[PDB]
Amino acid sequence: DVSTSYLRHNEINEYLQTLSQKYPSLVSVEEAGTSYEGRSIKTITINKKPGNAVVFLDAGIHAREWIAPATALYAIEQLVEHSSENQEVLSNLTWVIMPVVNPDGYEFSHETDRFWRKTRKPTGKSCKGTDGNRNFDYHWGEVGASTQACADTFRGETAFSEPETRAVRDAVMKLKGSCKFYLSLHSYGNYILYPWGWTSKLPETWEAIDEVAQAGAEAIKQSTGSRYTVGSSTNVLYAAAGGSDDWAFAVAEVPISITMELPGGGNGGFNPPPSSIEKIVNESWVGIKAMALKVAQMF
């Protein structure tokens, strides 16, 4: 259903609203903010129960990473339309899922430039766009972030200069204390990463996050056999200071903060053909559910 094609941002929002109409006692669809160009950045809250641990999942902060919102939508479909098959992650866990963080870039990638990455807000002439995953206010503007407005990793004019990242900030801040698992979906590379993105040194509680990441990689290995490399983002992939996972872990005090690089496909890596969507999201959901189950089992 949601894994047969790449949905446009408007179609994604209508799907969320339809689920709100169809499952009002299970889900609530809320607007977390407005993009720079005026698009509604929506989230869906699944199984809201008082005192529950909260899993916050976002995707599509980078425009060209189409498989990340597709995986997030597939996770929504499994949890909402097939809740009877996912009771283990629907008892003490509450899900807040933001399928698209950067709708302006995402729509731009569909219409104008397939491999656009940043947002679409002008940066002060001659270039548009800010790297959303370099725009969070924790070690902002440091190694792995560029001061040049035209670079792929432009940190932005200031920290949280983009309304898209402010929407993520406000949604996670509203769940401070209750949010125990922050998951940010990216593509590509087959990685499950955690802080830090500003140094190669590991956080004090890196083992706890590593165990959650190991569970996701192990479940995928048992299910499909695909390999996911686990480690800190700086050590495994590259330095990425200003990322959302670092900010959620350190500022929002989310104990388990993970960035996931979903499988690549096509000639550019970011563009698997629509026929490949179903297999990729199915495999990715196996890992995502396993990490959430590991989080739920902590209590």
Q: Between residues 27 and 101, which has the closer beta carbon with respect to other proteins?
A: 101
Rg (CA), the chain: 17
Residue nearest to Zn ion according to CB distances in the complex: 186
Q: Which two tokens stand for residue 164?
A: 């898209």
Q: Binding site for Zn(2+), residues?
A: 62, 65, 186
Q: Does residue 31 have an active-site annotation?
A: no
Q: Work out whether 134 is an interface residue with Zn ion (CB under 5 A).
A: no
Nearest to 121 by CA among 142, 149, 146: 149
Minimal distance in Å, beta carbon 44 to other proteins? Answer: 25
Among 42, 62, 155, 294, binds Zn ion (CB under 5 A): 62
- Say how many Å lie between the first and final Cα of the chain, rounded: 34
Of 57 and 171, nearer to other proteins (C-beta) is: 57
Contact call for residues 139 and 203 (beta carbons, < 8 A): no
Kind and range of the H or E run holding 16:
helix 9-22
Euclidean distance between CA atoms 216 and 44, whole angstroms: 23
**What does the binding site for other proteins look like in residue numbers (CB under 8 A)?**
62, 65, 115, 117, 131, 152-153, 186-189, 191, 229, 231, 234-238, 261, 268-270
What's the min distance (Å) between Cβ of 209 and other proteins? 18
Rounded Cα distance between 263 and 207, Å, is 24
Handedness of CA 239, 240, 244, 247 (dihedral sign): positive
In angstroms, the Cα distances linking 63 to 109, 238, 289 are 6, 20, 24
Q: Contact 184/259 with Cβ under 8 angstroms?
A: yes
List, edge to edge, every strand of the sheet that includes 191-194: 27-34, 40-46, 93-98, 53-59, 179-187, 256-262, 191-194, 229-232
Taking each helix axis from N to C terminus, what angle separates 67-81 and 277-296, rounded to the nearest 10 degrees? 60
Residue 255's binding partner out of Zn ion, other proteins, none, with CB under 5 to 8 Å set by partner kind: none
> Least distance in Å: CB of 160 to Zn ion?
18
Residue 294 binds Zn ion (CB under 5 A): no
The annotated binding site is made up of 62-65, 117, 133-134, 186-188, 238
The two three-digit tokens of residue 65, written as one number:
């990473």
Amino acid letter, 232:
S
Q: Does residue 186 touch Zn ion according to CB under 5 A?
A: yes
Which is nearer to other proteins, 70 or 96 (by Cβ)? Answer: 70
Residue with smaller CB distance to other proteins, 236 or 293:
236
Q: Which does 269 bind (CB under 5 to 8 A by kind): Zn ion, other proteins, none?
A: other proteins
Taking CB under 5 A as the binding criterion, the range among 59-67, 123-131, 200-208, 280-288 that sits at the site for Zn ion is: 59-67
What secondary structure does DSSP assign to 230-241, as a single string? EEEHHHHT---T
| Closer residue to other proteins in complex, CB, 134/294 | 134
Q: How many residues bind Zn ion (CB under 5 A)?
A: 3
Q: How far is the CB of 13 from other proteins (least distance, A)?
A: 25
Q: How far is the CB of 191 from other proteins (least distance, A)?
A: 8
- Among residues 107, 164, 261, 283, the one annotated as catalytic is 261
Catalytic residues: 261
Residues that bind Zn ion (CB under 5 A): 62, 65, 186
